[PDB]
Design a binder for this molecule. Structure first.
Ligand SMILES: O=c1cc(Br)cc[nH]1
Length: 287
């Protein structure tokens, strides 16, 4: 309103409405996120994210706290990965572009993780793409700052430790989510499309096997673990993500280990043999 020349809804988001807007002073187009309620503890923490700049992170340009309302101003990108995968469904996203995107996303996570910032809620809708071949992660650091959010809150990319009620997060949660997204780019079908917490957890178990103390020391002491969970056998990744090659299947394995401590780091993933032949292709992007 006061500081924007024109504002347009472009979707519901995790914390509130997201608008495409034009800054009145500069004329630039930005993404403006209204945070649905302001807690003073959240304003300082999120303001720190204004300094957290990388080519694969959506730039937080401004934090605007006026009229007892909170807005986040981000750099605008024209499409998200959810929409791009839908648009790409007949053909699939080409493998070199999948590889480019995964490599770039890992660079963004490695950067944020090195600065002790987690995402905690990665999903295709928060991965934004441009016509230049870049992909960028939006909303790093918001989940820690804002806590429990006030439409459905997709569970499909949630790591098993959070589904088992651990109220501790680590960098591994983001690697899990990215592994799920990698698999979805390859197969054209969400890996674990749960529509409740237990369905989500059981979809994971039916593919990866029910975890136990051998593969995941400590699991049976997780808050929401039940000894009565069914015991499913683990499937080979060759059945789960064909026609991904053995480098891709080996990297995905390491991103989807049950024990968060065993999951590959973003920095180590960048060195995986899967990326030996990575390139940066131009996407077929219809805006
Ligand atoms: O977390 C796991 C479980 C098995 Br079995 C193999 C690899 N990773």
């Amino acid at each position: 309103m006061e500081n924007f020349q024109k504002v347009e809804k472009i979707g519901e988001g995790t914390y509130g409405v997201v608008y495409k807007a034009r800054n009145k002073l500069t004329g630039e187009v930005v993404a403006l996120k209204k945070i649905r309620l302001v807690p003073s503890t959240a304003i300082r923490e999120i303001s720190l994210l204004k300094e957290l700049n990388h080519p694969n992170i959506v730039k937080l340009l401004d934090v605007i706290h006026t009229e007892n309302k909170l807005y986040l101003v981000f750099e605008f990108l024209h499409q998200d990965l959810k929409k791009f995968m839908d648009a790409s469904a007949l053909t699939g996203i080409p493998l070199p572009l999948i590889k480019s995107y995964l490599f770039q996303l890992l660079q963004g996570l490695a950067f944020c993780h090195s600065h002790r910032v987690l995402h905690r809620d990665l999903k295709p809708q928060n991965l934004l793409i441009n016509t230049e071949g870049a992909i960028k992660l939006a909303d790093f650091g918001l989940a820690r700052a804002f806590g429990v959010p006030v439409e459905v809150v997709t569970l499909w990319y949630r790591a098993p430790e959070i589904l088992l009620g651990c109220k501790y997060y680590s960098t591994a949660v983001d690697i899990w989510s990215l592994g799920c997204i990698f698999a979805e780019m390859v197969t054209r079908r969400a890996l674990f499309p749960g529509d409740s917490e237990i369905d989500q957890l059981f979809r994971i178990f039916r593919t990866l096997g029910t975890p136990d103390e051998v593969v995941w020391p400590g699991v049976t002491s997780m808050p929401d673990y039940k000894p009565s969970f069914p015991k499913w056998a683990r499937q080979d990744f060759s059945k789960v993500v064909p026609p991904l090659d053995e480098d891709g299947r080996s990297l995905l394995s390491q991103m989807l280990h049950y024990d968060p401590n065993k999951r590959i780091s973003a920095k180590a993933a960048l060195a995986h043999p899967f990326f030996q032949d990575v390139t940066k292709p131009v996407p077929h992007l219809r805006l």
